[PDB]
Design a binder for this molecule. Structure first.
Ligand SMILES: CN(C)CCCS(=O)(=O)N[C@H]1CC[C@@H](n2cnc(-c3ccc(F)cc3)c2-c2ccnc3[nH]ccc23)CC1
Length: 292
């Protein structure tokens, strides 16, 4: 099917926080693209809201370029430059084992993406391996962040007024990577995006997390059981047998005040110093690059 007069819509490659993802073609420029379709007659319309967030992020390192946004037949449409596999897919493909070097390469960029998003007055609130994609081709060394479906302003663009402290709030993101505060029902802010990244990095290190695969009656009960496990697992127990840097990072995030601007620089320098002790070079040879 034609889309925006110059895009041909391919096959469904997967699914977003809302809407389905297709792998299409920019017929005119001969480039493969990604196309998010959302039903026009949907009760909870978002794509246009999401689009405006992607538009504010344009020109950022590790932000996918919008090609086109429109309505066509039954569908609202966003067309992005095509990106590669997610870190969840690359991790599955690497038998759920990343070398310390890959974890440190990823962590350096991922902190930087989260910092760029915070600089544009938004929190992500669904930091998880699925929402980081590697580029293709010459961009194969770049971690991209995607999916602003659950994202939200934390400060007014002009006044930089932080949102107010609120409690009694639905766990909206992914339970596995949620901050301890998020489980307590506190409004997500910058520190929470970074805590989540912290649980994502330890997931990369361990192959899983201790609160992963908990049985219960309902989703509601499972979340409580995850909260209970997270809060009763000390950070030094989670990170036992891994470099102290992972523990130091999570401790620093758990220390951050609701409205604190995090020291992104410090946290990058944390893993950079360890990178240098380990004698690794920043040559962007990830584990999946070594497969043959
Ligand atoms: C349990 N299993 C079955 C579910 C796991 C979830 S999944 O669906 O397999 N995960 C992948 C789906 C595609 C990917 N993705 C999600 N949204 C966009 C997107 C595309 C266009 C757009 F305008 C806005 C956003 C993409 C995506 C896919 C490929 N290239 C991309 N260039 C920019 C986004 C993107 C995330 C990774």
């Amino acid at each position: 099917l034609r889309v925006g007069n110059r895009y041909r819509l391919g096959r469904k490659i997967g699914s977003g926080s809302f809407g389905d993802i297709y792998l299409g073609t920019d017929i005119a420029a001969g480039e493969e693209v990604a196309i998010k379709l959302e039903c026009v007659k949907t009760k909870h319309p978002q794509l246009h809201i999401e689009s405006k967030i992607y538009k504010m992020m344009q020109g950022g390192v590790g932000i996918p370029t919008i090609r086109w946004c429109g309505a066509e037949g039954d569908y609202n449409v966003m067309v992005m430059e095509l990106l590669g596999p997610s870190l969840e897919d690359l991790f599955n493909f690497c038998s759920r084992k990343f070398s310390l070097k890959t974890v440190l390469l990823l962590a350096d960029q991922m902190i930087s993406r989260i910092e760029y998003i915070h600089s544009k007055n938004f929190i992500h609130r669904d930091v998880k391996p699925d929402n980081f994609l590697m580029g293709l081709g010459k961009k194969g060394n770049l971690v991209y962040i995607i999916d602003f479906g659950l994202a939200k302003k934390y400060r007014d663009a002009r006044t930089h007024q932080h949102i107010p402290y609120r409690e009694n709030k639905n766990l909206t993101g992914t339970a596995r990577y949620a901050s301890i505060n998020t489980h307590l029902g506190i409004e997500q802010s910058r520190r929470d995006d970074l805590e989540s990244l912290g649980y994502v990095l330890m997931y990369f290190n361990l192959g899983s997390l201790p609160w992963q695969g908990l049985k219960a009656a309902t989703k509601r009960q499972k979340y409580e059981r995850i909260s209970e496990k997270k809060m009763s697992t000390p950070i030094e127990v989670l990170c036992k047998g891994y470099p102290s840097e992972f523990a130091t990072y999570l401790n620093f995030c758990r220390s951050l005040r609701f409205d604190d601007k995090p020291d992104y620089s410090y946290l990058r320098q944390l893993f950079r110093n360890l990178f240098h002790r380990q004698g690794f070079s920043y040559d962007y040879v990830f584990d999946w690059n070594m497969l043959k």
